[PDB]
Write a protein that binds this ligand. Structure first.
Ligand SMILES: [Hg+2]
Ligand SMILES: [Hg+2]
Ligand SMILES: [Hg+2]
Length: 754
């Protein structure tokens, strides 16, 4: 392959990034996209430093700050994009071209060149600048000199000699993985188009393959669909999206060329659309639980990330077999149609607009989010759905960090892994409308929490980023899931708690046991901490209303239920007092992210909690949540033994669902919970149907070779489905022995016959 093939690829890349081939005359969304492009370009031009011997390119960006050096280069690539977009205000404009070139020249001379060693964040030098600079080089190819292209390739090759690796030489270089691998490879692939380097191009394409190879520990994609980055953080929703975006663009660019991605194992990446990404998409937003430090970003939200995922999936759909293309497009049409809160076309690029219009033209119907349970044991995350709600649980364990912070971002997120219960609903903005600027980071929904204040950036014993806990894990059978977390508190307080969740098609039962701490501070468990936006949403009880006065906490009656207007119901399953607080909270994004704006956001919250007191001894809680329940349905929750607490202690926690005819349990120690027993740590859900017993079981430590259940519901003679060995115990009970070697927390489904 030669000059003609490289010119075609540069032109394909310019087509992709401008949409110049696909702009529709008179389409109002394309018109708004051209406006947004024009407004940004004009903002950047007006901010140009026009001075002789200027030491910056823009008056508001310092080249000595590595982040602002990146922004200097993305502004320049944006300007070059606009300059190349038909109908844009600066399209083909000579003065604008001159300004872009002078900007690239001066940034190189002053800062970003092959004689400069990196200072500050490696990512700026190796990913931020090279992707932008390379785009600019490709957009401006006809206008840039041989000398300019040489200098700019020399700079990129100096900082990124091999995109399979990262870090400046001073540091020891390590293998780049996941999102970083994709981004490094992208920068080199586009630079290789500008410099017509097939050797570098081919190496960089080959580098992509590692990112979709299954792993069994640490960074990457797991067979259960989990995606981990930063070694110990669930990351499908942010880094996973970066990966997804870059691959979509690169696969599209190279397709049907001499450089096309032909690694047949890329099917693993395609399988991740449904296996990894779709289950953590919620009405257009990536779940906060799988987006790590990005929750602290005012302008990199769950909806921003979901919209990026949708763009990518639509782009990838073009190359798939008909059935898969249609399935992906139907998933996307649903994520778009249900999202009336941040509609995808508002502020969309020209390329994104084109893909969303293309989707609308297929006539593919929106696909609903399926009810039920999607478990991700490798990353300590579960998803659960019913009509009108999605529950996302955020756990932590000896595999999964309490939280991830860095670069000034998410330093306060230390409780976000302490058993959070995110209930996503038709309140589409619940977690987006300045939630992370205003929420009480010590009273996040669902958590158990030692009230000891923790410093920003706190770590555990000996600098540990992961709790040395017993296990976190889950299983599910049909409509019911069992999830457990042995919580070890962050910040060396000595908090311990056994938290479990039993989730049906409608209601979530939350049990807690064995709670104590070493700090001397009171411990709380948070039934909810719920954004009311600017509302005065009523809290209704058997006795009338509660918490009518902001700032004055009240204790619930013996009615034991409370309904929150606009949300649903809560009910207590023990005698713990429930404290109910209506509160107005304020904060700026600058309080949670070094880059956040100073604007103060003020939001109303409803906060419902149990106080375990100071020095609890085997403290406990038991409550349930009924998203979408009316007042009348909430009043009825505790009637007729519908939700039965079978056991709630340091041995086991278990609930029977009457209507579902299903029982769920977590075991901490060998023992019985009602008529089910386990020989060690386990999650179990079981249901009898006539002469058959169905069970789901997991071995949640991920380290035991075997597990034996003592079966409920009498005698069992045969194993119809799944693997396992029946026996009988000393008391005449049937037992089921499982070989759990290497199961990695995955569920075994078993069906037995009488
Ligand atoms: Hg610099
Ligand atoms: Hg070059
Ligand atoms: Hg941290």
């Amino acid at each position: 392959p030669g000059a003609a093939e490289f010119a075609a690829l540069r032109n394909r890349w310019v087509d992709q990034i401008t949409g110049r081939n696909v702009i529709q005359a008179g389409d109002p969304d394309f018109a708004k996209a051209i406006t947004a492009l024009n407004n940004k370009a004009a903002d950047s031009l007006a901010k140009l430093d026009a001075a002789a011997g200027r030491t910056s390119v823009f008056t508001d960006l310092s080249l000595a700050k590595d982040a602002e050096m990146v922004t200097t280069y993305t502004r320049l690539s944006q300007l070059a994009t606009a300059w190349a977009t038909p109908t844009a205000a600066v399209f083909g404009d000579a003065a604008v071209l001159a300004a872009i070139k002078a900007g690239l020249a001066d940034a190189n001379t002053l800062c970003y060149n092959d004689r400069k060693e990196e200072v500050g964040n490696w990512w700026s030098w190796e990913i931020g600048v090279p992707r932008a600079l390379a785009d600019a080089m490709v957009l401006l190819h006809a206008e840039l000199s041989a000398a300019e292209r040489t200098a700019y390739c020399a700079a990129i090759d100096h900082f990124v000699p091999d995109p399979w690796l990262q870090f400046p030489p001073k540091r020891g270089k390590i293998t780049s993985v996941g999102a970083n691998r994709v981004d490094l490879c992208q920068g080199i692939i586009i630079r290789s188009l500008a410099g017509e380097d097939p050797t570098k191009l081919n190496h960089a394409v080959a580098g992509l393959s590692q990112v979709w190879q299954y792993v069994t520990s640490g960074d990457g994609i797991f067979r259960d669909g989990s995606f981990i980055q930063h070694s110990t953080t669930p990351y499908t929703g942010s880094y996973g999206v970066v990966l997804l975006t870059g691959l979509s663009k690169l696969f599209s660019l190279l397709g049907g060329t001499a450089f096309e991605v032909s690694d047949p194992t890329r099917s693993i990446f395609f399988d991740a659309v449904e296996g990894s990404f779709a289950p953590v998409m919620i009405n257009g937003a990536m779940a906060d639980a799988v987006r790590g430090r990005s929750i602290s970003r005012e302008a990199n939200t769950g909806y921003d990330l979901g919209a990026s995922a949708i763009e990518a999936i639509l782009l990838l759909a073009r190359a798939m077999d008909p059935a898969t293309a249609a399935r992906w497009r139907g998933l996307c049409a649903g994520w778009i149609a249900r999202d009336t809160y941040r509609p995808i076309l508002n502020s969309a690029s020209v390329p994104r607009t084109a893909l969303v219009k293309q989707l609308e033209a297929t006539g593919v119907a929106p696909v609903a989010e399926a009810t039920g349970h999607k478990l991700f044991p490798a990353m300590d995350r579960t998803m659960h759905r019913g009509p009108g709600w999605a529950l996302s649980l955020a756990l932590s364990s000896n595999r999964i960090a309490w939280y991830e912070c860095g670069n000034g971002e998410n330093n306060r997120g230390y409780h976000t892994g302490s058993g959070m219960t995110y209930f996503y609903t038709s309140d589409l903005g619940q977690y987006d409308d300045a939630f992370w600027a205003t929420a009480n980071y010590n009273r996040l929904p669902g958590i158990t929490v030692d009230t000891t204040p923790l410093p920003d950036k706190v770590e555990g014993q000996w600098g540990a980023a992961v709790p040395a806990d017993e296990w976190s894990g889950a299983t599910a059978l049909g409509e019911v899931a069992a999830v457990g977390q042995h919580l070890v508190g962050p910040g060396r307080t000595g908090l311990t708690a056994r938290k479990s969740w039993f989730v049906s098609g409608d209601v979530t039962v939350c049990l807690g046991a064995d709670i104590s701490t070493a700090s001397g501070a009171k411990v709380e468990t948070i039934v909810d901490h719920r954004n009311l936006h600017q509302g005065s949403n009523t809290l209704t009880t058997a006795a009338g209303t509660i918490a009518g006065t902001a700032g004055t906490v009240e204790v619930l009656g013996d009615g034991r239920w409370v309904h929150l207007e606009g949300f649903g119901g809560y009910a207590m399953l023990d005698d713990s007092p429930l404290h109910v607080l209506r509160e107005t909270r304020s904060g700026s994004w600058s309080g949670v992210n070094i880059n956040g704006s100073a604007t103060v956001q003020q939001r109303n919250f409803a906060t419902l909690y149990v106080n375990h007191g100071v020095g609890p001894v085997a403290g406990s809680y038991a409550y349930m949540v009924a998203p979408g329940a009316s007042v009348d349905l909430t009043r009825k929750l505790l009637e007729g033994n519908k939700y039965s607490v079978i056991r709630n202690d340091a041995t086991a926690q278990s609930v029977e669902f009457k209507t579902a005819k299903t029982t769920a349990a977590t075991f901490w120690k060998p023992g019985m919970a009602g008529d089910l027993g386990a020989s060690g740590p386990a999650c179990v859900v079981f249901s009898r149907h006539g002469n058959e017993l169905s069970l789901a079981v997991s071995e949640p430590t991920q380290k035991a070779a075997g597990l034996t259940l003592t079966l409920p519901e009498g005698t069992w003679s045969s194993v119809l489905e799944g693997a396992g060995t029946l026996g009988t115990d000393a008391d005449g009970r049937s037992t089921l022995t499982l070989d759990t070697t290497g199961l990695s927390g995955k569920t075994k489904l078993i069906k037995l016959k009488r």
